Amino acid sequence: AALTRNPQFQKLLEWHRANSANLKLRELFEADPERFNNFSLNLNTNHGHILVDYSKNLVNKEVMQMLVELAKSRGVEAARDNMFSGSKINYTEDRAVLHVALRNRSNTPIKVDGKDVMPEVNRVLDKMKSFCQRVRSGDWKGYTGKSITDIINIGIGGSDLGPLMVTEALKPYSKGGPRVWFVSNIDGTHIAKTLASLSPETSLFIIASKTFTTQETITNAETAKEWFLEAAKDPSAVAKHFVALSTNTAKVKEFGIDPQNMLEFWDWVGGRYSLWSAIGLSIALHVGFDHFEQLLSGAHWMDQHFLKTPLEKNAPVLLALLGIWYINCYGCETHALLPYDQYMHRFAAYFQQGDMESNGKYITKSGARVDHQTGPIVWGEPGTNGQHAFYQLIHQGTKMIPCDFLIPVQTQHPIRKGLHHKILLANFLAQTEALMKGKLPEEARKELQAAGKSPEDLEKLLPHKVFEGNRPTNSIVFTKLTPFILGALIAMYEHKIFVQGIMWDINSFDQWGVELGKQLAKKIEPELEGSSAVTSHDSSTNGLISFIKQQRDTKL
Amino acid sequence: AALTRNPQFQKLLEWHRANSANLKLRELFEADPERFNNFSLNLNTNHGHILVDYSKNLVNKEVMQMLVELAKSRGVEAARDNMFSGSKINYTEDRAVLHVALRNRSNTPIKVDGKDVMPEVNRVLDKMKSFCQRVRSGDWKGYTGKSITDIINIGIGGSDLGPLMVTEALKPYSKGGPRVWFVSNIDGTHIAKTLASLSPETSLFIIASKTFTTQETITNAETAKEWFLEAAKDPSAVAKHFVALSTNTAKVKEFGIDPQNMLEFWDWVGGRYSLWSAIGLSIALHVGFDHFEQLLSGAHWMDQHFLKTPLEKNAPVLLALLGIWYINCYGCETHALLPYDQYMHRFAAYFQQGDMESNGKYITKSGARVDHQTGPIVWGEPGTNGQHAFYQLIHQGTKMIPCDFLIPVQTQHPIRKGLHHKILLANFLAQTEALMKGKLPEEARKELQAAGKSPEDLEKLLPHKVFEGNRPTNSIVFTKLTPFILGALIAMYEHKIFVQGIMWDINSFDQWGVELGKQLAKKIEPELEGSSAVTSHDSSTNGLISFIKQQRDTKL
Numbered sequence A, B: 001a002a003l004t005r006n007p008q009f010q011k012l013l014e015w016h017r018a019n020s021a022n023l024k025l026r027e028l029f030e031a032d033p034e035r036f037n038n039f040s041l042n043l044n045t046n047h048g049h050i051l052v053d054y055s056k057n058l059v060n061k062e063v064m065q066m067l068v069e070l071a072k073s074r075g076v077e078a079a080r081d082n083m084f085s086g087s088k089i090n091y092t093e094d095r096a097v098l099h100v101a102l103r104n105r106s107n108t109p110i111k112v113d114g115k116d117v118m119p120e121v122n123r124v125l126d127k128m129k130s131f132c133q134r135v136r137s138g139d140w141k142g143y144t145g146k147s148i149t150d151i152i153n154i155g156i157g158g159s160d161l162g163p164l165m166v167t168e169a170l171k172p173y174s175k176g177g178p179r180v181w182f183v184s185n186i187d188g189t190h191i192a193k194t195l196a197s198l199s200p201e202t203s204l205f206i207i208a209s210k211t212f213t214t215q216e217t218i219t220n221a222e223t224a225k226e227w228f229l230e231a232a233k234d235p236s237a238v239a240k241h242f243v244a245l246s247t248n249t250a251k252v253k254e255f256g257i258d259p260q261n262m263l264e265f266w267d268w269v270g271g272r273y274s275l276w277s278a279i280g281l282s283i284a285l286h287v288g289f290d291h292f293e294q295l296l297s298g299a300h301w302m303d304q305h306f307l308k309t310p311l312e313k314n315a316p317v318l319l320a321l322l323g324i325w326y327i328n329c330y331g332c333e334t335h336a337l338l339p340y341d342q343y344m345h346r347f348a349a350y351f352q353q354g355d356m357e358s359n360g361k362y363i364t365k366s367g368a369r370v371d372h373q374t375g376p377i378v379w380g381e382p383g384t385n386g387q388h389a390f391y392q393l394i395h396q397g398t399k400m401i402p403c404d405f406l407i408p409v410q411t412q413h414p415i416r417k418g419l420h421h422k423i424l425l426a427n428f429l430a431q432t433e434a435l436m437k438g439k440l441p442e443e444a445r446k447e448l449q450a451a452g453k454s455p456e457d458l459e460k461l462l463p464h465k466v467f468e469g470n471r472p473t474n475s476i477v478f479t480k481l482t483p484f485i486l487g488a489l490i491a492m493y494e495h496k497i498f499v500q501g502i503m504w505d506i507n508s509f510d511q512w513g514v515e516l517g518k519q520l521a522k523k524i525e526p527e528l529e530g531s532s533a534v535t536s537h538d539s540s541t542n543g544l545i546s547f548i549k550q551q552r553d554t555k556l
């Protein structure tokens, strides 16, 4: 595997072995009054600032230099330039990787197979803009002559998580827009509970699927169409109530939607990088096309920051390198995303797909099996909720857990003259300070002494009250969570993921690991029908099927 | 540390070192046709069946025997009896641990300080019943004389997660009940967006907190009171719209709440074990007291199973033991909970608190620091959604991740003559089969050959298409997700957590690790107010505060 054979990596690992035990965050800060200044980036986007403070990490000047040299030796800059120029860097599928084209506001040509993609990107955006105007204005009418009140996105994974997360995060920008609903699970609860609250006369369905063959999405779409036709009783009315977002015109036609009712995207748009494309239609419908364009513009700003900045001062590069340090040198399995923002409640779930489906890989570009760790398990809940759930384990468990804490300076709801946001900010700051500093036995002893505890009760309680500290965090703070800033943040993590994949020599852009489960499910489907025993699998699968058939008709 | 010095543990570890590399799930099933039969428990509760199939784990007869022996020699049987009898097993706080008393339907006396707690448990339950009749019938009137249509639970952590997860899971049982809302985050978005959808005339607030001084909860509660009084304009009207789940009589009275409308619980009720207490009021209001009683009865059934069953066939003990094997022998940091049920969408988040805040610990009963791992990081999303987000990494990444797959046989929504549920079940079954079996080079090769790939393309793609398999799972299948069965499931995991804590020699029932962040936040809060530079912390905390003070003025 290319990483472990790399001499710059071996140097880093050797240094970690010899010296890492001596790194103490409390002491790093005491020895260096300039530590924050030297280990943070303050990015002025001209539409707000993003501060990436990486000073509370187990690093020094030497470590950062070694990490930057490693990025250089792994060819990160050339790989990046190849992505942006439309090279077919998705080598297992022989595809370009061009989510950066979707938000290329500059309109500089990007060629695939000698042909500029920007005219077709811009054509679809124009069509999206026109459609959003028609629906949001009340002009677009349903089959009984009423304006649309509800938009229902039907899709799963990449066709669900982005639009859901973004509409949730940008909820204050949705005033006067139609309601949005997301249906994703094949579990019939999902579509049933949604349809229960809706009228066929005023509901517009958006069928979102790159392939247009995904079982959950097509089944859900068929159920929706059946519910719709039971009321409308007119096949021609489908064109007023269903729109398709796909690359696969043939399958869209087969489902019963005309290409005029389809907004297209392309094979070089990965599903988990797709919200910037036609897949973002439900975002644009909910918040308006203007705000959708600002989302794209913010991503574009971050794209240019990634493209043009020297590695040592490049935000997604530094984030990627810190992650490699913890993954490949410290062996940490996980990475927590902890946004102190209730609107961002689905941000961590989004990056579960974005990170884990990209970099949860084990074969390199050479065909070699990796002999090192690749992508981490991503998880998290918004602050302050998480503090009262799982921070006990972060402070006093036995796992090292790199955390990114995120927060806007300005709240969308400055209620009680700012009291709530003041408290929120205080907790944001205090938690990373606590994780860094800890509490020494001598400090805990004095607290117990002052609390009026007896020598007997004191000694029994003391060790439980000690915080070992030295737990590293990033703090990412931004002026306000606007559409533009959100776009910049999402793109920043997209590029972090890219940099890590290149350093591991894996393909961040394929997903062969989902195929086997789909195949085995198609085999089991027919076996569930009827009351005969199944014997064709291992004894567990067979036994679970027996239980299902036995318990099917028990009237509880 | 006790565990590492235990001879049964050292034997298990030595066996792992010598033999674990040769455990292959495919081979284990091939060699033993009785495997499912001998490595599963089919529990008949008389109100449905719960099948705990642990056969797809990296264990054999000898391993389970070694594991059960370790549980015995770590004192699991004696510790359990001590919990059930009211012994003060929460040893750092000198407290009993009696969530089992809350649902003790048998009413067998359980004594704390020589006094039976059951009369008081039953009195509060009776008051809850009365409250439910009043609100649900429409007899409880708001300040303008109208029936209540909306219930708002205000609370954090254990005062929020349980009621939220259970009302979400039991949504079908809520017919005729008032709508329920949960406000928890201090982030003012949470209360603001909730109150915007509400009428002061028809909304009832439930303030959930032991001390009635918890900062986030009391601040949110005070904001709700202010909004209410803007419309009502009469301090005496508060008593018709605010109730408390608390013991602090004076504070509740000062708030304006009729002390009649305070429902009590006790210090032996841990927050993360509290939904079974007065804290469950919002559940009982939403689905009715009868269904709440069914929830308690399900937990009671599992309590009796845990208490009376020999270890080798005791469901929560076996789950705990498999966890110890993966944590302390294989070194797996995480445990995934994957319910194939949209109604269970908050189940994993609930057990983040239940598990991580319980067992994210590092000091043993003797005061010594553990020299072994304790509680895992718990995470997950409902199936099938997770398949399209992160299962790529579970199948083809570099992490070993024990997963529990959960599903009901019968759906609450059998739409399209059961087609959706048939598909859901097929995926549930197929994913654990896939994780176990993988896909061999010989199988992938035939697929590439059929696809018409060239010799060169076949060779290059082949390793990317192989699934190594040997990834262990539990499958937990149950007749239907009723209130009773849900209660049984929650209690099962409560007791799994308890068993692991005993084996690690830690206190599952305190939470000293949340204290430091609370102290540091209280110090920072007043520092944010004015314009002056803050220099009293480390340079990162100071620099982050400087950025906040500079950016809060910026106009975008």
Ligand SMILES: O=P(O)(O)OC[C@H]1O[C@H](O)[C@H](O)[C@@H](O)[C@@H]1O
Residues within 6 Å of the ligand: A155, A156, A157, A158, A159, A208, A209, A210, A211, A212, A213, A214, A217, A271, A272, A357, A511, A514, B387, B388, B389
């Ligand atoms: O957009 P679709 O063609 O319906 O595919 C949706 C999804 O399904 C798959 O399982 C893959 O995990 C993803 O890459 C994707 O987001």
